[PDB]
Amino acid sequence: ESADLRALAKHLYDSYIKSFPLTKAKARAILTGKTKSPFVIYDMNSLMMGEDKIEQSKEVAIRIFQGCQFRSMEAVQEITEYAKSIPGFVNLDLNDQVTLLKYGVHEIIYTMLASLMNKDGVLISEGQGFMTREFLKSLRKPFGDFMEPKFEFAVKFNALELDDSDLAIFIAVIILSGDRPGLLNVKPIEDIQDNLLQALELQLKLNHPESSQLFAKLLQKMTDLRQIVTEHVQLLQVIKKTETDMSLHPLLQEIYKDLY
Amino acid sequence: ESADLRALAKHLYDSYIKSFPLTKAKARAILTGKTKSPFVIYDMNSLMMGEDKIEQSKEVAIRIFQGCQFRSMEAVQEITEYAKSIPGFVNLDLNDQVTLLKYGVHEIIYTMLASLMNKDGVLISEGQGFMTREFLKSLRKPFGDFMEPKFEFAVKFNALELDDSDLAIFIAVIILSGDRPGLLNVKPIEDIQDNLLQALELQLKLNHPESSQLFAKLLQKMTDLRQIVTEHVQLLQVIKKTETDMSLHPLLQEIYKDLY
Ligand SMILES: O=C(O)Cc1ccccc1Nc1c(Cl)cccc1Cl
Ligand SMILES: O=C(O)Cc1ccccc1Nc1c(Cl)cccc1Cl
Ligand SMILES: [Ca+2]
Ligand SMILES: [Ca+2]
Ligand SMILES: [Ca+2]
Ligand SMILES: [Ca+2]
């Protein structure tokens, strides 16, 4: 029923707002000067000014890649806490909850990252910096490309003009993907996802009534996100196998690993 | 200088207040009826009422032990975030930061747990429940004793009448313990700890002027906390080796382990 499907959407939106302080709405207000201004990092010189202006220094490409990777592991906390807020999720087998999050989190980071991006760059530091796409592309191989697949995805994705209320539900659908390798009980995952898919269809109808077959464009984009996490995962093996000794885990992840 | 030592103490107190929402002050107000009242769990019947009144059910002793263990891994987050707030900590080698937290966190949990305890029981659920000591002792072997060393430590510890401002510093001293096995650069750990020890001595002088040699009683208690984490660690091996398949890691710890 439409009452339920809307209350669910309203519930996910509120939890999203709770879990994720920097919203697409705010990010967009910052990117367009509706708001304060972020420090622009466009060259080595401004990177150095910038990182001063908001343990170890080692060559910049590594520091940048490392920051991205830390910010991503950092983000896992807010995403995990969001996923628990999804009706029926905390009632799945724990091994399945873990698997869903294991394969989902990068897809969600890239989705939310796009809220922070425009063809020219990306907001960092809770909106306090703006790093250009060409600056990132300027980094030496293999680092000069780690962000391009994200920018390429983001520009097409952002053309859809989704707003946080649609994203709250989109992200929930991706978490609950019953085809992750290694799942124990696929059925109750697909049940929940199909309520979620129906709340999403209704959402886009009301929210994007001049955009029929928009739901199908979004379904398309979940495929586009697998391609990106696979390129990213393969790039990471290559960096691990060619660039000795960078730390890619923030403190909390290191201690949770070690207490295990 | 005394200005510095006090500003440091003031800084640690504020970070403590930030990191740790349930303070000893509040806990004590609850335990004495200064405040609302917590649900008392004193028997199986009240445990069942209680756990209703605030994925799987398996025999109660395991559910209780499991909750304690989850709450402890949960607490690691707030402690980690507290430790970063300690001047010079985030400037140590990461491997050393990790080691300090690896061996420190249980000592701190037991210290802060004592803020939640009286000879008769312990507050749980952010102060919403009160589980009796005898109820915990009633659980079948080997569970009937996992909390007694904590109660025994807590009663003696609480006799010292420390208040959150002293605890803020105490906890910082324990984190920075330069004798943890496996530390790479012990020196800069002992430097920081000795500023911390001086801020603590000054703190107790001002805060407990009728209690000379109180500092030495607290130093004594860091030894008492090693004994408890060792009994706890050995009890845990025994439970792991005798009681199949309980989950002892909350979700975030499972995903951080798996993304590693
Ligand atoms: O900095 C932030 O808060 C945004 C964010 C979130 C997830 C992943 C990366 C980033 N930012 C960011 C990026 Cl997108 C690339 C390189 C370095 C950094 Cl610090
Ligand atoms: O419940 C809480 O918030 C307090 C807390 C903190 C750390 C460790 C354990 C506990 N509580 C608690 C205890 Cl002390 C024993 C058994 C079960 C529980 Cl849920
Ligand atoms: Ca600098
Ligand atoms: Ca619209
Ligand atoms: Ca029940
Ligand atoms: Ca006093």
Swiss-Prot record, chains A, B:
Similarity annotation: Belongs to the nuclear hormone receptor family. NR1 subfamily.
Name of the coding gene: PPARG
One of the record's GO cellular component terms: RNA polymerase II transcription regulator complex
Motif segment (9aaTAD): 250-258
Subcellular location: Nucleus; Cytoplasm
Name assigned to this protein: Peroxisome proliferator-activated receptor gamma
Residues annotated as domain NR LBD: 4-258
Portion held of the full protein: 235 to 505 of 505
Keyword Protein biosynthesis in record: no
Disease link: Defects in PPARG can lead to type 2 insulin-resistant diabetes and hyptertension. PPARG mutations may be associated with colon cancer.
Source organism (scientific name): Homo sapiens (Human)
Signal peptide residue numbers: none
Inhibition and activation profile: PDPK1 activates its transcriptional activity independently of its kinase activity.
Gene Ontology molecular functions: alpha-actinin binding; arachidonate binding; chromatin binding; DNA binding; DNA binding domain binding; DNA-binding transcription activator activity, RNA polymerase II-specific; DNA-binding transcription factor activity; DNA-binding transcription factor activity, RNA polymerase II-specific
Residues binding rosiglitazone, per UniProt: 69-72, 106, 232, 256
Induction: (Microbial infection) Expression increases when incubated with M.tuberculosis or its lipoprotein LpqH; induction is TLR2-dependent (at protein level).
Posttranslational mods: Phosphorylated in basal conditions and dephosphorylated when treated with the ligand. May be dephosphorylated by PPP5C. Ubiquitinated by E3 ubiquitin-protein ligase complex containing FBXO9; leading to proteasomal degradation. Ubiquitinated at Lys-18 by TRIM55 leading to proteasomal degradation. Ubiquitinated by E3 ubiquitin-protein ligase STUB1/CHIP; leading to proteasomal degradation.
Top-rank lineage group of the source organism: Eukaryota
